[PDB]
Amino acid sequence: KEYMILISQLEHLQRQGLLSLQKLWFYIQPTLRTMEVLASIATSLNKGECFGGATLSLLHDRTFGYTGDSQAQELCLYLTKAASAPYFDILERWIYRGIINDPYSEFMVEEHWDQRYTIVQQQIPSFLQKVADKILSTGKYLNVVRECGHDVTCPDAKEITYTLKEQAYVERIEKAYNYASKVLLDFLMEEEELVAHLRSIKHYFLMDQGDFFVHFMDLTEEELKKPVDDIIPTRLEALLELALRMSTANTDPFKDDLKIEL
Amino acid sequence: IKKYTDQRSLDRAFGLVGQSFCAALHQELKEYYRLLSVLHSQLQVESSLTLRRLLVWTFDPKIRLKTLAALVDHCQGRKGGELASAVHAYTKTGDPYMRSLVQHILGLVAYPILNFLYRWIYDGELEDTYHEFFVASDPVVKTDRLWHDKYSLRKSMIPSFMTMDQSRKVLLIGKSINFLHQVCHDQTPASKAMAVGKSAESPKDAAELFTDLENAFQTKIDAAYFDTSKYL
């Protein structure tokens, strides 16, 4: 629009027509500059065939190279900022709920029990893979709390990355998945009791309180002389539950999860 | 100047400064053409058409483009660093007729150079392809730190507005800013205010202070060198 509007303005001077091959030649050398950079981005895009974050990293490389000319830097900045404000909005729409939508797989992360979000090597953000691993694990923890219920909100009311600061914005992304860990660590400590689950398994599984087991070891000397028959494993669960309450377990729903291998 | 734009066409090759110098060379090429358009409006009917009056209307571009022929005769190459020693040798001449015009180029040849600098003070994410700055960042394979110098300063491309003690100074800040990344901290030193300053400086430069501030640019980096050190 800015290119076509100068051509019409000098046509008002064409009805008073005295303009030169030289006065025109000066205005076209700035606007060959605007068009040659745009052509050389377009020529690279025909040879490239990239899309998504692979386009975002190509445009991030053009912010490095086109420095030294101020006005070639300003469009290559603006082309990167206009390619990232879609992309980091697809980031933010994956952070508040976990809405993965793919018109042509703009974002990298594809939907998989599985835990298979697996970033892609096809695409990479404007930064290196460290922020891609940081946002991948963000989507893994918000999907854990989403499995319980739909309750999380991003800590800002609006997430912006279309600003010259971008490395301080992936560090406010990292303090966000740390908080998602903390509300998962919340959900461990309130209802789930991870510490009591590891206490009820592990050192008790090596053997911690043998009075549960020496009662059961009285009943490994009468039965366990031959391999198991068809009526033997029905008795073995009857003896585990017998040896539960003769030695006074303190929490019964943490010890009924024991099953018996054939 | 037309053949210089024909040789300008690169992706961005062997220097970020080299086509930045031709970008301004397209801006001062641009100014010659507005002086051609005011001549063609003389030609048709809508003054007298003698040569002796357009001679002195081209004699004022004759002081303009001839001192651009000295700027194109200095540099055949497009590698930065030696371009910064070229325009600083042209501003040491007096007579602020073209000295204002080479200060335009001095403020713009430096503008890729100092854009390497203050971000490497502030965040330190290396962005070299052909080492347009005199500090070539990571040309040696990554090793654990035994106080080995990976950032050499390379005398062949030192800018003439950066003296000898400031060339070693920005190495001393740039070596410490990388040592605080592998300290199990990604925190920019002691505050998030080291981001704030970079943004303020970049807008200020964008609308204001076009001439380089080589006396004042060395002041607040020393007021950056002291805070990144004690936080470390």
Sign of the C-alpha dihedral computed for residues B181, B183, B186 and B191 taken in this order:
negative
Who's near B107: CB < 8 A, 6+ residues apart?
A: B210, B211, B212
The two tokens of residue B84 are 């910064």
Residues with Cβ within 8 Å of residue B154, at least 6 apart in sequence: B81, B131, B134, B135, B136
Tokens of A140: 């893994």
Q: Give Cα separations from B81 to B65, B168, B221 (angstroms).
A: 24, 16, 21
> CB A23 to CB B39 under 8 A?
yes
Closest CA to A74 of B206, B15, B126, B124: B206
Question: How far is A140 from chain B, CA to nearest CA, in Å?
Answer: 23
Q: Are A107 and A87 in contact (CB under 8 A)?
A: yes
Q: Do A22 and B40 touch (CB under 8 A)?
A: yes
Element (H, E) at A63: helix A53-65
Please tell me the distance from the alpha carbon of residue B84 to that of residue B116, in angstroms, as a whole number: 14
Best A18, A38, A69 residue to mutate vs chain B (most B CBs within 10 Å) = A69
Taking CB atoms and an 8 Å cutoff, what residues of chain B touch A68?
15-21, 23, 80, 108-109, 111-112
Backbone angles phi, psi at B106, to 5 degrees: -65, -40
Q: Which experiment gave this structure?
A: cryo-EM
> Contacts of residue B108 in chain A, CB cutoff 8 Å?
68, 70
CB burial of B190-221 (b: ≥16 within 10 Å; e: otherwise) equals eeeebbebbeebeeebeeeeeebbbeebbeeb
- The distance of A29 to chain B (nearest Cα, Å) reads 6
Resolution of this entry, Å = 17.0
Give the Cα separation of B133 and B17 in Å (integer).
Answer: 9
B86 half-sphere exposure, CB direction, 13 A CA radius: 21
Residue in this structure with the two tokens 């303005």, named with its chain if needed: A9
Q: Select from A29, A68, A164 the Cβ nearest to the Cβ of B199.
A: A164
How far apart, in whole angstroms, are the C-alpha atoms of residue B195 and residue B199? 7
Confirm or reject contact between B31 and chain A (CB < 8 A): yes
Q: Given its phi and psi angles, is residue A232 left (phi above 0), alpha (psi -120 to 50 degrees) or beta? A: alpha
Question: Identity (one letter) of the amino acid at B155?
Answer: K
CB atoms B80 and A24 under 8 Å? no
CA distances from A12 to A4, A15, A18, B44 (A): 14, 6, 11, 16
DSSP label at residue A97: T
| Contact between chains at A23 and B31 (C-beta distance less than 8 A) | no
Please tell me whether residue B49 adopts helix, strand or coil conformation: coil
CA pair distance B61, B172, nearest whole angstrom: 46
CA A95 – CA A107 distance, rounded (Å):
12
- Whether the CB-CB separation of A16 and B46 falls below 8 Å is answered with yes
With residues binned 3-state (H G I as helix, E B as strand, rest as coil), the percentages for chain B, rounded to 5, are 60, 0, 40
Integer angstrom CA distances of residue A106 from A101, A102, A210, B157: 9, 6, 58, 42
> How close B69 comes to chain A (CA, Å)?
18
CB atoms within 10 A of CB A115: 9
Query: What count of other Cβ atoms lies within 10 Å of the Cβ of residue B78?
Result: 22
b/e A77-99 (16+ beta carbons within 10 angstroms → b): bebbeebbeebbbbbbebbeebe
Question: Going by C-beta distance under 8 Å and a sequence separation of 6 or more, which residues neighbour residue B157?
Answer: B79, B80, B81, B82, B84, B85, B131, B134
Q: Where are the beta strands (DSSP E) in A16-167?
A: none
Structure token digits, residue B227: 């805070």
Residues of B in contact with A65 (CB under 8 A): 11-12, 16, 129
Amino acid symbol at B138: D
Cα–Cα distance, A234 to B94 (Å, whole number): 105
Task: Report the 10 Å Cβ neighbour count for A181.
Answer: 14
Nearest CA in chain B to A10: B37
User: Encoding tokens for residue A45?
Assistant: 């895009």
If you search the block for the tokens 């005199």, which residue do you land on? B134
- Asked if residues A33 and B23 have their Cβ atoms less than 8 Å apart, the reply is yes
Distance (Å) from the C-alpha of residue B86 to the closest C-alpha of chain A?
15
Please say whether the beta carbons of B100 and B67 come within 8 A.
Answer: no
Q: Which amino acid is at A131?
A: V
Which of A127, A124, A152 minimizes the C-alpha distance to A139? A152
Distance CA B3, CA A250 (A): 90
DSSP secondary structure letters along A193-241: -HHHHHHHHHHHHH-S-THHHHHHHSSSSSSTTS---SSHHHHHHHHHH
C-alpha–C-alpha distance, residues B190 and B229, integer Å: 10
**What percentage of chain A's residues is helix, strand, coil (to nearest 5)?**
60, 0, 40
Contact A203, A260 (CB under 8 A): no
SS3 B181: coil
Query: Residue B124 and residue B126: Cα distance in Å, rounded?
Result: 6
Query: Which residue in chain A is spatially nearest to B113 when comparing CA positions?
Result: A68
